Write a protein that binds this ligand. Structure first.
Ligand SMILES: CS(=O)(=O)n1c(-c2ccc(Cl)cc2Cl)c(CN)c2ccccc21
Ligand SMILES: CS(=O)(=O)n1c(-c2ccc(Cl)cc2Cl)c(CN)c2ccccc21
Lengths: 727, 727
């Protein structure tokens, strides 16, 4: 008789259990038993206590994370965790000897270390501190400082700056050990002329003057960071002479203009692959660099370059694909568009231009997961032609026809969204099942692909959910101009298709987005349907991903058009399904969704009663360069300034008179700047439109403070309930 | 059958006519006939066109203001007006010869001039440009640069910095010509170590990166600006040698610590009076400085110092009073507290300590308006014991008993709030009547005080107002602990004391405030009562002015206490009048009112349903030093840190759960910093209270943009209507 209330979502009353493990060897992994770390065996499921809780009672500090050295002799300890941006943070580090069972108290890793990583084998150590790189050959010995040029907010050695972190690497780190730990490949970023975004930080009430944050941040068309790439030989590091770092220069075609280092991948011990991208993100080059013994330098033969380019839009889904090399390093696999525009696996041969495709069809390969000498293991959405499903497939390297599905039939009813975790030589794999049923976690041996045991089945959650009226989940498609376009609906408990429901359209709709999937979730929508009887829906229209280029490249150079209209058209289709009170239709989104939400409410379609935009982009000139220019080119008279000018929400301010509007922005948002919503709010005030604002002091782009998270969703629920006349 | 709507207020449908004039001689003034400037005669009411409109058709620029040189030979023209803060601005200037009828095109006054003023007689000219002072002896000759030290945001010569402008002088200028124009007294402000307030400015949508504003601004207890004072002799300015500026140093008792220059007044050609104030604003000294012919220097005899100090709080209403000297400069008059704590006129004698009072009683002299050799003319609120009335009184200098009221009886029904404008030798005076009836403007001759003619009677407005259902206005008092405490009520049309009305408490309630007066007004309240039938009320409680020190010094060192409780108690009194729906009582205020509004809503009294705080101070440590410390002393363990800590709105965040709350702040407010509302909004989010926010992009402290002014009042009306359940 009870429903999924707001407080159930805001308090995690029903918690989804994960099974988070990490492979140590090829048959041994680790797990956290609330307080204990064990070494589980991949053969038997027997575990012995690897690390007890009372091991670091005496430490004094709270331990954020840990890290085992590859040989299993040392453990790196992380504490005083201070977050920066999406991936970046700062921590104090301690090394603990596992065999001697004691803290290394000499030559300790400094406070405020930006990044640390063990070498792939043994126990070498590379850390970045004040933007410079240091290498430790032994945990208790001095560290050789490899770089000297590192300067705050200007020169980044072995770590990324803002825009590379967010948009290019999805990591703070910019270091790459060679396979056996001999070479340390690193990148360097010059931000000298990159402009600063500035904003207040009001901080604790005890701070009398607001602080001002200043981040090097290239908005669309402004001066970008510049990048150099280096490889240093750690084995011949000297106490007496500074370590010499060999530079691999960008190729001819990339130097002629602004460019990006967008991918670094080691092939073998003496082989490394670089992928450069042009600022105009439709032309990329892949250099393959070998080590010359006599020279001591790296040489990339021109005849080994490979061009990944695209006539119909940007290259890659968000960045070009990474390569997966055979062991001998004379051959690799990656995911490119085929001639009909669908992303599949091409078998490349080191020395030739033409590659041959190993998979094909009207569906896309999502990722390459591991390759052995016998098999290539990949995930795709081929199963039942469902773009929103994920399944694991193995392909035989001796016969491209022999392709087995390893996950499709395991549990076809409860399980359709899979992800994988292979052991250190791909002997075993963990399968995470994400929906539509409750998450399921299993372990298998890839020799015969048979199941071994259930790691987590969420039966503890299952039992509790029977006591609650849960909403149901409809994934389906519709036909627009002869193409399938998928949508999902979170349908209220005891759903009655003859009754008339209020509908909340939940929008993201960015380039290569996908809001219609088979993933079980417990979010606000769950509550909205369950307690408030509102049908929340999502619809992947033009420019959404995993369906080929034709659909994804549709919005090329035309952001804020087709995908906006497609959202309006989606609601129009939903109200023509006849179970929708077309007088009470609302739209809401975050980030890009925030934007679409605003462009739709400002469209004048008349379809939408009200809507909420959280942290919206308002015009593209205000957003970071790499993301924007990827889809928009440059805001110049010679490029695309016209459609930059022509696609802002400020320009649509008049039509907002027709709707009710809640705009929310975190004041300390470094990603989508407060500036964006401030420029919207102004435009509306100017043309006399009334709306609702909520700023969030010192909240950033996630508004994910413990307390702000609660408050923002409470605030929105009140807004939505009232706009739908629900008491 | 029609009422005063919202659009009548937001569009000025019913406009109050002023009569704005400026005396040129002792019997000739100027007026603006929409497009024309005339010279009206004070004897006959005959006017000849002084300046035609088509005189500056050819100018090309729009002319913001004008200014006549005292002799009537030159007119100064103001254009390209760019506003800075409350009084400060920046303009291009042109001088036009009135007799030759042409623009002076040589040695023109520079663009971005910060301030200009004619010398009291003749046609000398002093201007401030890039923080340095320049003097022009003739409109077409080079200017002598008096100062060389002026530096942006640091050194201010002859103009004020932020805090002096806002809190001390109420002017941008810091120049004072001597009576006949020989000496130019100026002030200098050092801001070297004054900290900066920083904030974004989002500007036009065409600005890609928000700008950051940086103003030297001393918050409570921080480092203040320092000040020096100079007198330069303009008659002996040289082309060849730099002009020498004689410094008058602050007295011994002022130098021992932090202090202010708070008043500069010339007594005679060779006599000047300075009033210094301690940072602890209860001790002030007045130095009187005389010119030494042989020296060429200024000497202020110690035996001519006068101390104005206060045992029970701060000295003066907002600053110490200014002196009004007899012609010979051996005697002056000013407004100080008498021994029973009410402000009256003391007759000071240059060479002695003790002054004798010329007026007395339980009421207060408001201002001294002009003195002749025969009469002192002042405004007070004595009439009918009404603190909220203003009337003109003349007092005989030969007999302190003979005091005539010049305005009381003129029109006792329509007119109770008077202000005055005397001619250049006090031969004639203009009376502005401000209420309770329609504003009335009359002219009189002070020789026999008889009326001469009606200048403006607003009959044009009167005619229109008969067609509209107007609200009525009740001024009255109540008795709390044996003291009278006044309140006013804007009562809805056709008011029915047996019916039950919704009440909006309109609060300011700052030190020396007065919201209960006899002034006719057309504001939001008019509409609220007229169209929405809401009783809006105001109540001057403890800490309010014009009633003696006992009432005003009540909140000394105790801001955010008595005056807050007294607002709650006021509502409690109003609901005990029985025409009030005590289920629908709301509070709202701006600035200090914003604060009290928020302190009341956070009180937990239960009396108030909802309320709106616009640009509120949230804790006193965040507000400028001179204002704060005046009432609060220093936020230090040895002074008053405890009550700084104990009187914040953030600390009352929990109780806001009981009320509904709209917080509004302009993001580019340099006065009450956004920081303040941002710290409130945080406090609430943290304790889980829901509220409403509205930020105002680039709006400052007045939120007085044409468009924002409309938008904010619309938004608030919606909030108030809905909180009162009015459709
Ligand atoms: C949550 S997001 O889809 O909006 N998102 C966005 C994103 C995309 C577009 C816009 Cl307008 C805003 C954001 Cl936060 C980025 C930046 N590329 C990202 C990176 C890593 C993970 C998620 C990310
Ligand atoms: C409009 S105000 O009463 O709030 N006000 C305030 C004021 C007083 C207190 C607070 Cl918390 C805020 C303001 Cl704007 C000042 C600053 N002393 C002022 C100067 C000249 C004219 C009006 C002024």
């Amino acid at each position: 008789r009870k429903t999924y209330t707001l407080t159930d979502y805001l308090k995690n009353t029903y918690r989804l259990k994960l099974y988070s493990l990490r492979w140590i060897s090829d048959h041994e992994y680790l797990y956290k038993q609330e307080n204990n770390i064990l070494v589980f065996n991949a053969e038997y499921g027997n575990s012995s206590v690897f690390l007890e809780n009372s091991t670091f009672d005496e430490f004094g500090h709270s331990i954020n994370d840990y890290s085992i050295s590859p040989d299993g002799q040392f453990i790196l300890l992380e504490y005083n965790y201070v977050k920066q941006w999406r991936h970046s943070y700062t921590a104090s580090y301690d090394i603990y000897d596992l065999n001697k069972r004691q803290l290394i108290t000499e030559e300790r890793i400094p406070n405020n270390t930006q990044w640390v990583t063990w070498s792939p084998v043994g126990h070498k150590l590379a850390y970045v501190w004040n933007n410079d790189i240091y290498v430790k050959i032994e945990p208790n010995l001095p560290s050789y400082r490899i770089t000297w040029t590192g300067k705050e907010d200007i020169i980044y050695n072995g770590i990324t700056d803002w825009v590379y972190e967010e948009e290019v690497f999805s990591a703070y780190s910019a270091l790459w050990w060679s396979p056996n730990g001999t070479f340390l490949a690193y990148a360097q970023f010059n931000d000298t002329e990159v402009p600063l975004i500035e904003y207040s930080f009001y901080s604790d009430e005890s701070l009398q003057y607001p602080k001002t944050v200043r981040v090097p941040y290239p908005k669309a068309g402004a001066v970008n960071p510049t990048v150099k790439f280096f490889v240093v030989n750690t084995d011949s590091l000297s106490s007496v002479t500074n370590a010499t770092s060999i530079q691999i220069t960008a190729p001819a075609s990339m130097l002629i203009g602004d460019h990006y280092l967008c991918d670094v991948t080691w092939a073998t011990q003496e082989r490394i692959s670089l992928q450069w991208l042009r600022r105009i993100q439709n032309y990329s080059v892949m250099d393959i660099c070998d080590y010359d013994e006599s020279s001591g330098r790296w040489n990339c033969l021109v005849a080994r370059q490979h061009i990944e380019m695209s006539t119909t839009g940007w290259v890659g889904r968000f960045r070009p694909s990474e390569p997966h090399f055979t062991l001998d390093g004379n051959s690799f696999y990656k995911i490119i568009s085929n001639e009909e525009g669908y992303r599949h696996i091409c078998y490349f041969q080191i020395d030739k231009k033409d590659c041959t495709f190993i998979t094909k069809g009207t569906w896309e390969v999502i990722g390459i997961e591991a390759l052995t000498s016998d098999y290539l293991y990949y995930i795709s959405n081929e199963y039942k032609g469902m773009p929103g499903g994920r399944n694991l497939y193995k392909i035989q390297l001796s016969d491209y026809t022999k392709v087995t599905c390893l996950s499709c039939e395991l549990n076809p009813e409860r399980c359709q969204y899979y992800s994988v975790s292979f052991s250190k030589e791909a002997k075993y794999y963990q399968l995470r099942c994400s929906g539509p049923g409750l998450p399921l976690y299993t372990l298998h041996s890839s020799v015969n692909d048979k199941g071994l045991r259930v790691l987590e089945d969420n039966s503890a959650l299952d039992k509790m959910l029977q006591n609650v009226q849960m909403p149901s989940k409809k994934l389906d498609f519709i036909i627009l101009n002869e193409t399938k376009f998928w949508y999902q609906m979170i349908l209220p408990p005891h759903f009655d298709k003859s009754k008339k429901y209020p509908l909340l359209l939940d929008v993201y709709a960015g380039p290569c987005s996908q809001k219609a999937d088979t993933v079980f979730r417990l979010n606000w929508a769950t509550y909205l349907a369950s307690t408030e009887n509102i049908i929340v829906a999502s619809f992947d229209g033009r420019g959404s991903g995993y369906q080929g280029d034709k659909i994804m490249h549709a919005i090329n150079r035309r952001l804020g058009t087709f995908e906006v209209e497609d959202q309006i058209e989606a609601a129009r289709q939903f109200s023509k399904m006849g179970f929708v009170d077309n007088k009470r239709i609302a739209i809401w989104g975050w980030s890009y969704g925030g934007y679409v939400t605003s462009m739709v409410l400002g469209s004048g379609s008349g379809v939408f009663k009200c809507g909420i935009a959280v942290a919206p982009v308002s015009r593209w000139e205000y957003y970071d360069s790499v993301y924007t220019e990827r889809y928009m080119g440059l805001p110049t008279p010679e490029d695309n300034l016209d459609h930059y000018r022509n696609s802002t929400v400020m320009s649509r301010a008049e039509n907002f008179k027709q709707v009710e509007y809640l705009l929310i922005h975190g004041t300390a948002d470094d990603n989508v700047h407060f500036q964006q919503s401030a420029q919207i709010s102004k435009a509306l005030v100017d043309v006399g439109v009334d709306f609702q604002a909520m700023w969030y002091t010192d909240e950033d782009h996630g508004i994910a403070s413990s307390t702000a998270h609660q408050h923002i969703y409470t605030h929105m629920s009140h807004f939505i309930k009232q706009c739908f006349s629900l008491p």
